[PDB]
Amino acid sequence: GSGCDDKCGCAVPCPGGTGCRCTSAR
């Protein structure tokens, strides 16, 4: 499902999902 990690390069307790820059990279 969803649930970020610090390994991503952004905070773990995310603001939600899609709006975050979590997927603006490739």
Chain residues in the site for Cd ion (CB under 5 A): 4, 8, 10, 14, 20, 22
Least distance from Cd ion to the Cβ atom of residue 25, Å: 10
- The residue (of 1 and 14) whose beta carbon lies closer to Cd ion is 14
Cβ proximity to Cd ion: between 1 and 8 the closer is 8
Q: Count how many Cα atoms sit within 13 Å of the Cα of residue 22 in the half-sphere of its side chain.
A: 18
**CB of 9: closest distance to Cd ion in angstroms?**
7
Write the CB contacts of 14 (distance below 8 Å, at least 6 apart in sequence): 2, 4, 20, 22
Alpha carbons 17 and 21: distance in angstroms, whole number: 9
